[PDB]
């Protein structure tokens, strides 16, 4: 038994990282990663066939973070830019059922 964890929300707001601490691979098709900052929420939807393998991490970078896409461990959030430090951010992870399965709030 393990689970998908929101491992880190970049303090300089360029990326968000998830980790499958479980021994079993976990398909992410449909799963939704919601970035909330104040009154605005932006949703990142994982592709239909994306799988976060056991013990693997996946980092979602801002399209302007200057990082090049390196699937499957590093993806680029198309059209979403960095949010800069000092910004109270909240990340919600919803499974392929619309039901929450994790949450993390920076302070």
UniProtKB/Swiss-Prot annotation:
The modification Phosphoserine is found at residue 96. Residues 1-107 form the LTD domain. There is a cross-link at residue 94 (Glycyl lysine isopeptide (Lys-Gly) (interchain with G-Cter in SUMO2)). It is found in: Nucleus lamina. The modification N6-acetyllysine is found at residue 45. B-type lamins undergo a series of modifications, such as farnesylation and phosphorylation. Increased phosphorylation of the lamins occurs before envelope disintegration and probably plays a role in regulating lamin associations. Belongs to the intermediate filament family. Homodimer. Lamin dimers then assemble into dimeric head-to-tail polymers. Ultimately, two head-to-tail polymers assemble laterally into a protofilament with a uniformly shaped rod of 3.5 nm in diameter. Interacts with SPAG4 and SEPT12. It is linked to Leukodystrophy, demyelinating, adult-onset, autosomal dominant, typical: A slowly progressive and fatal demyelinating leukodystrophy, presenting in the fourth or fifth decade of life. Clinically characterized by early autonomic abnormalities, pyramidal and cerebellar dysfunction, and symmetric demyelination of the CNS. It differs from multiple sclerosis and other demyelinating disorders in that neuropathology shows preservation of oligodendroglia in the presence of subtotal demyelination and lack of astrogliosis. Leukodystrophy, demyelinating, adult-onset, autosomal dominant, atypical: An autosomal dominant, slowly progressive disorder characterized by pyramidal signs with muscle weakness, spasticity, dysarthria, dysautonomia, and demyelinating leukodystrophy affecting the cerebrum and cortico-spinal tracts while sparing the cerebellum. Patients usually do not present with autonomic symptoms. Lamins are intermediate filament proteins that assemble into a filamentous meshwork, and which constitute the major components of the nuclear lamina, a fibrous layer on the nucleoplasmic side of the inner nuclear membrane. Lamins provide a framework for the nuclear envelope, bridging the nuclear envelope and chromatin, thereby playing an important role in nuclear assembly, chromatin organization, nuclear membrane and telomere dynamics. This is Lamin-B1. The gene is LMNB1. The chain holds residues 439 to 545 of 586 of the full protein.
């Amino acid at each position: 038994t393990g689970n998908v964890c929101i491992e880190e929300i970049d303090v300089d707001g360029k990326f968000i990282r998830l980790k499958n601490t479980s021994e079993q691979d976990q398909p992410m098709g449909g799963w939704e990663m919601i970035r909330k900052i104040g009154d605005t929420s932006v949703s990142y939807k994982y592709t239909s066939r994306y799988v976060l393998k056991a013990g693997q991490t996946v980092t979602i970078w801002a399209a302007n973070a200057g990082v090049t896409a390196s699937p499957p461990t590093d993806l680029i959030w198309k059209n979403q830019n960095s949010w800069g430090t000092g910004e109270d951010v909240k990340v919600i992870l919803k499974n392929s059922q619309g039901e929450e399965v994790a949450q993390r709030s920076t302070v």
